[PDB]
A paper describes a structure:
Here, we report cryo-EM structures of human H1-containing tetranucleosome arrays with four physiologically relevant NRLs. The structures show a zig-zag arrangement of nucleosomes, with nucleosomes 1 and 3 forming a stack. H1 binding to stacked nucleosomes depends on the NRL, whereas H1 always binds to the non-stacked nucleosomes 2 and 4. H1 contacts DNA with L1, the amino-terminal part of α2 together with L3, and α3 to stabilize the nucleosome and contribute to chromatin compaction.
The H1 histone is present on nucleosome 2 in all four structures, and is also observed on nucleosome 4 in all cases where this nucleosome is structurally resolved. In all ten focused-refined maps, H1 shows three DNA contacts, similar to what has been described. The H1 loop L3 and the N-terminal part of helix α2 contact nucleosomal DNA near the dyad, helix α3 binds one linker DNA and loop L1 contacts the other linker DNA. H1 that is bound to nucleosome 1 always contacts entering linker DNA via its helix α3, whereas H1 on nucleosome 3 uses α3 to contact exiting linker DNA. In nucleosomes 2 and 4, the entering linker DNA is in contact with α3. We found low Δβ values at nucleosome 2 and Δβ values of less than 6° at nucleosome 4, where H1 was always observed. The distance between nucleosome 2 and the nucleosome stack increases with increasing NRL, which leads to increased mobility of nucleosome 2.
Author numbering:
A (entry chain c), I (entry chain g): 10 to 118
B (entry chain d), H (entry chain h): 30 to 124
C (entry chain f), F (entry chain b): 20 to 102
D (entry chain e), G (entry chain a): 37 to 133
E (entry chain u): 35 to 109
Write the structure that this text describes.
DNA sequence: GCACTGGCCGCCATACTGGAGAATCCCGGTGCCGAGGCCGCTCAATTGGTCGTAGACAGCTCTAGCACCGCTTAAACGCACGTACGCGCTGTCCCCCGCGTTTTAACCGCCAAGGGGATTACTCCCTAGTCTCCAGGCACGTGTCAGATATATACATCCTGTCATGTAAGTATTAAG
DNA sequence: CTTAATACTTACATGACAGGATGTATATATCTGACACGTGCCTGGAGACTAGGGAGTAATCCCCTTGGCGGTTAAAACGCGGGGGACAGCGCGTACGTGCGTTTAAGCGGTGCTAGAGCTGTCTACGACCAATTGAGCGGCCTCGGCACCGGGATTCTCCAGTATGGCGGCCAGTGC
C-alpha cells in the first residue's frame, strides 16, 4: 500500500539528482551524517552555475552561428565572465585555446 | 555486457534544454561539463567537510555549504546561488 | 628500445606556433632550448606523480585519469577527461 | 617582383590564426616518443593510453601557453617585443616555481 | 619659412659656451625656447648636426653623431 | 565609534620599512596609494572569509583560529596561531 | 659641516637592519583600527581577539613582503632600481590576482 | 576548572633532546611546530584519503601513505622518510 | 590476568604518538578503515621531518650562539634548504622575517 | 665699376595616396559521422519505519576585550637640499622573420598480435568495536638563568680632504711660402 | 712679411690615499619572567576477542595497446635577405633620500565592565540503516543533417609606384662702397 514513487529532484523542482549527490556526499567521506537540506542546496547551486555557463556557451555559439556548442565556445564563455574566470583561474579547458586579446604595442601604427 | 558507468549526461542536457531548447552540444564539451560539475562538487564538499571539522560538527547541513558557497563563488554568483538554494530548500520543506 | 634524444622532436616551428598562440610577436634564438628545459621539468614533475599513482594502482599502463590527478595535485587542473 | 610582407605583420597573422583556433600545435607522435622516453626513466616498459598521451599533451601546451602570456607581459614590461630567456626565469620566479 | 636651422644652432652654441660642449637635448630646448617646431624636425636636426660636425664649424665633445655635446671650433 | 578613513593609518614610513624588508632600494612616491589599495583588497578577502567563518560559528567575536582557516583557504598559510 | 651619507647607503642600512630583524613592522593601533573599520562593513559590532589582529599583522606583512620581492624582481628586470606601481600590477597579474 | 587542549609539546621536546640535548625552545617556536605537525599531518592524510578515493579503496595502509610521501615530498627527503618509515614498520611488525 | 600496557610508539621505537595519530585519522574523516601500519608509518615520517627541521634549527641557533630556538631560526632553516623550501613555499612563519638577501645591482660599485 | 648679398627660382630628399596582389571572408555544394532519439535493462533512489544520537536551547560563570585615563617619549611629518635615477633620443649593430626550395617523417590507413585491465569468485587478514584498566601528557605551581637590557670599547665603512697625475688648453716660436 | 705648424708650459678634471665620524659590532653587569621542571590526574591509550568484511589472489578475455609497411605530403630544415629590434651612451630633469626640527599619537601602565566564550544539562528533532520496489538513468543501435571538406568570388588588408611639400642649392640683380 505504498504511495507513488516520487523524486526529490521533482520535490525541489531541480534537474540535478538529489539522490545521487546525497549518495556521493555519503560515500565521499566528508561527514558520517549529512543533513537533508544539503544535497538540495548543493544541487541547486550546481544547476545555477550550469545555467549561466551553458547559456553563455549557447550565446557564444550563436555569435559563431553554430547550434552545437564546442569547447572553444566554453573557453570563450568562461573567460568572458570575470567572476567565473576567478572561479576557474587555474583550470585548463581541453581544445579551448585562449581569448583573442593582443597587447596594444603589438599592433602597428 | 558492461557495468554501468555513472555520468552527468541527462541532467546537464535537460538544463541546456531549459535554458536553450534549440541548440546542441558536442560530447567533448559535455565531458567538460562533467569535469566542471565534479570539480565544483569536490570543492564545495571539501569545504563543507572542513567546516564540519572546525566547529566539531558531525553533520553536513545546508548552513555550512551555504557558508562555503559564500566563500568560494564571487559576489552576485554567491548571492544568487544562495537565492536558488533557499527557494529550493523551502520548496523541499513543502515536499 | 632505448631512446636518447626526443626533446628536439619538439620542433622550433612548433615552439613558434605555441608562442603565436601566446601572443608573442618575436622570438629570440635562445628561447627554444630553455623552453625545452622548462617543458622537460614540467613533464618530469607530472609523470613522476602520475607514475606514482600508476604503480600505486598495481597497473603497468598509464591511464588518462592518472594524468588528470597529477595535474589536479599540481594546481593545474584539466577539464575534458574527468572520468 | 615577388611579393613580400614586412616582418611582424605575418607574425601577427599567425597570432590571430592560431589564437582563434582550437587544434593541437605540436606533432603528436614525437610527443608520444618524448613522453615514453622520459617516462621509462622511472619505471621500465610503461604503456600509455592514447587518451593519456592526449591529456598530457593539452596539459603541456596549457602550461607552456600560460608561461608565454606571462613572459609577454614581462617583455612589454621591459619595453621590448621579443621575449628573452631572462623573461622566462622572471615569470618562473614570480610564479614561485 | 624663415632662415635655415644651422645659424640658429650657431647662436645656440654661442649662447652659453660652458666648459663642455652644448648637448643635443640642450640645443633642442634652445630651439624650442627661441621658437621652432623641433617636434617634426628631428631628422632635420640630426642631419644638421652631422652637417655641422662634418664641416668643422663645431666640434663634438663626448658623444657620437648627433648625441653628446657639441662645442665651437678653435677660432 | 564610527570609523571613517583609517586606510592612511598604514603610514608612509611603515610602507618604506616594509619595502626595506622587501629589499627595495628606492621607492617611488606614487607607490603608497596602490600599496594601500592592494593590502586593502587583501583585507576584504581575508576578513570576509573570517567573518563568513565567524557568523558561521554564530559568534560576535572574531578569533585567530578562524583567521588561520581563512589564510589556509587562501593558500597563504600562517604558522603560530593555534593551527 | 654636519655628517650626511649619500643616498642609498642609509637605505641599504635599513635593508640590513629590518631584514635581519623580526618584529612587527607597522604600527599596532592604527592597524587594529583599520581591521575594525573594514570588518564593520561586512558585519556590525564585531569584536576581535587581540591575537587575531596580530595574526592579521603577520599575514599582511608576509603577503606584502612577498609582493615586494616580486616587485624588486620586476624592477631589476626592467633595468631599474626604482619601483613603480605598474611593477606591482605586473606582479599581481602574473600571480593571477 | 579547565578543559585540556591536545598538542605535541612533549613530543617535539623529546625529539629535540634526542637530536640536541643542549638546545632549548621558545614557546613561539613550539607553536610553530604544533602548526607544522598539524599541517603536514593534514596534507598527508588528505592525499591518502584522496588516493583511497581514486582506487575505490576504503582502507588506508602504509602503502598509500608511502605513495603520498613520494607524491608530495620533493627529492631526497622522500627516500629518507621511506627509510625511517620502513625501519619503523619493521620493528612494529616484529613487535 | 592482564598483560602490562605497552605503548605502540615504544614498540616502533618512536617518540611520536602512534595512538594519537591513529585516533586523529579516525576523526579526521579520511577513511572508513585504517590499516595497522599506516599510523606507525605516518608517525615515523613526521618524527623524521620534525627531527630534521629541529636539527637545522638547533644548528642555526648555535650559529647565533643561542641556547633556545626562536621562529627566526625556523625561518632561516626552512628557507635555506631547497627540499624544505619546496615543501613550504606557501607557508608564512610569524615573526620570521626573510633571508639576508640583497640583489646584485642594489650593491654599490 | 665691382663685389656683396638678399631674393627668387630650380632641383632633390621626404612624406601623402591610389592601385595591384593576395589572405581571408563569404557564398554555395556534398557527403558523412556524431548527436540524438529510441529501446531494453538494472540498479539506485525511494519510502517507511525504527532507533540512537547530535546539536539546539537554556543557563551560569568568568574573563578577556573593550572603554577610559594619564604620562611619555618614538615616530610621523614636513621641509629642504642634494644627487641620483627614468627615460628619451639617436645611432649602431646584428639577429631573427619572411620566403623560397628540399627533404623526411607524420599521418593515415591497414594489418597482426598479445599484455594487461578488468571483471568475477573465493577465502582469509585484518580491523573496528567494546569492555576494562591504567600511566602519560596536560593543567598547574614554582624557581631560576638565557637573554633582554644597559654601559663602555673598538673597528668598519664611508664620506671627504689632499696631493699626484693625465689631459686639455693657452701660448711663443719659427720655418716656409 | 705673414701665418699656420709645433713644442712647451700650465690650470682643471680625475684619481689614489689618509683619516675622522659614526654606526655597528663586542665585551661586561643584572634582573627577570619565560622556560623548564616537579605534581595530581583522568582520560586517552592499550589489551583481548570477536563479527565481519574489504581485499588479496587466481582465471580469463578481449580489447586496447603495441608492433610494423606504404604513400604522401605538409611540415621541418636550410639558406638569403633584409629590415626591424635591442640596446648602449649621454643627458636632462626631476623626485625621492637623507637629515634637521616638530607634533603627535602610539605605546604603556592602570581600572573597571560586561558581553560573550565557553562549559553543562536536556532533549527533541533528525538523520542513518535497511527490506522491497520501480522507474529513471544508462548501455546499445541507427539515422540525418549540422557541419567538415571543397570549390568559387569579394573584400579588406599590405605594400609599393607615383605625386605634393619642405628644404637645399644656385643664380641674378640691386645697391653700397
Amino acid at each position: 500500500a505504498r504511495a507513488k514513487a516520487k523524486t526529490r529532484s521533482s520535490r525541489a523542482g531541480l534537474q540535478f539528482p538529489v539522490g545521487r549527490v546525497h549518495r556521493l556526499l555519503r560515500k565521499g567521506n566528508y561527514s558520517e551524517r549529512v543533513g537533508a537540506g544539503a544535497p538540495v542546496y548543493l544541487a541547486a547551486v550546481l544547476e545555477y552555475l550550469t545555467a549561466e555557463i551553458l547559456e553563455l556557451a549557447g550565446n557564444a555559439a550563436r555569435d559563431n552561428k553554430k547550434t552545437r556548442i564546442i569547447p572553444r565556445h566554453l573557453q570563450l564563455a568562461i573567460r568572458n565572465d570575470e567572476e567565473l574566470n576567478k572561479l576557474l583561474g587555474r583550470v585548463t579547458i581541453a581544445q579551448g585555446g585562449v581569448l583573442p586579446n593582443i597587447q596594444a604595442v603589438l599592433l602597428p601604427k | 555486457k558492461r557495468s554501468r558507468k555513472e555520468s552527468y549526461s541527462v541532467y546537464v542536457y535537460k538544463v541546456l534544454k531549459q535554458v536553450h531548447p534549440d541548440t546542441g552540444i558536442s560530447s567533448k564539451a559535455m565531458g567538460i561539463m562533467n569535469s566542471f560539475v565534479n570539480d565544483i562538487f569536490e570543492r564545495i564538499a571539501g569545504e563543507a567537510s572542513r567546516l564540519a571539522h572546525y566547529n566539531k560538527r558531525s553533520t553536513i547541513t545546508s548552513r555550512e555549504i551555504q557558508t562555503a558557497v559564500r566563500l568560494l563563488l564571487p559576489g552576485e554568483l554567491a548571492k544568487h546561488a544562495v537565492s536558488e538554494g533557499t527557494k529550493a530548500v523551502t520548496k523541499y520543506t513543502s515536499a | 628500445k632505448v631512446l636518447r634524444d626526443n626533446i628536439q622532436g619538439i620542433t622550433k616551428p612548433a615552439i613558434r606556433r605555441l608562442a603565436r598562440r601566446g601572443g608573442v610577436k618575436r622570438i629570440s634564438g635562445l628561447i627554444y632550448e630553455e623552453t625545452r628545459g622548462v617543458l622537460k621539468v614540467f613533464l618530469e614533475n607530472v609523470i613522476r606523480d602520475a607514475v606514482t599513482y600508476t604503480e600505486h594502482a598495481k597497473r603497468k599502463t598509464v591511464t588518462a585519469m592518472d594524468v588528470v590527478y597529477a595535474l589536479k595535485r599540481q594546481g593545474r587542473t584539466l577539464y575534458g577527461f574527468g572520468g | 617582383k615577388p611579393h613580400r610582407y614586412r616582418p611582424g605583420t605575418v607574425a601577427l597573422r599567425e597570432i590571430r590564426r592560431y589564437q582563434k583556433s582550437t587544434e593541437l600545435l605540436i606533432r603528436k607522435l614525437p610527443f608520444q616518443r618524448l613522453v615514453r622516453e622520459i617516462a621509462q626513466d622511472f619505471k621500465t616498459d610503461l604503456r600509455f593510453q592514447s587518451s593519456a598521451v592526449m591529456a598530457l599533451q593539452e596539459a603541456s601546451e596549457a602550461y607552456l601557453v600560460g608561461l608565454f602570456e606571462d613572459t609577454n607581459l614581462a617583455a612589454i614590461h621591459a619595453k621590448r617585443v621579443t621575449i628573452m630567456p631572462k623573461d622566462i626565469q622572471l615569470a618562473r620566479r614570480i610564479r614561485g616555481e | 619659412s624663415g632662415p635655415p636651422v644651422s645659424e640658429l644652432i650657431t647662436k645656440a652654441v654661442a649662447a652659453s659656451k660652458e666648459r663642455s660642449g652644448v648637448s643635443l637635448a640642450a640645443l633642442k630646448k634652445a630651439l624650442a625656447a627661441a621658437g621652432y617646431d623641433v617636434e617634426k624636425n628631428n631628422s632635420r636636426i640630426k642631419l644638421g648636426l652631422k652637417s655641422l660636425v662634418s664641416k668643422g664649424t663645431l666640434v663634438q665633445t663626448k658623444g657620437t653623431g648627433a648625441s653628446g655635446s657639441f662645442k665651437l671650433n678653435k677660432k
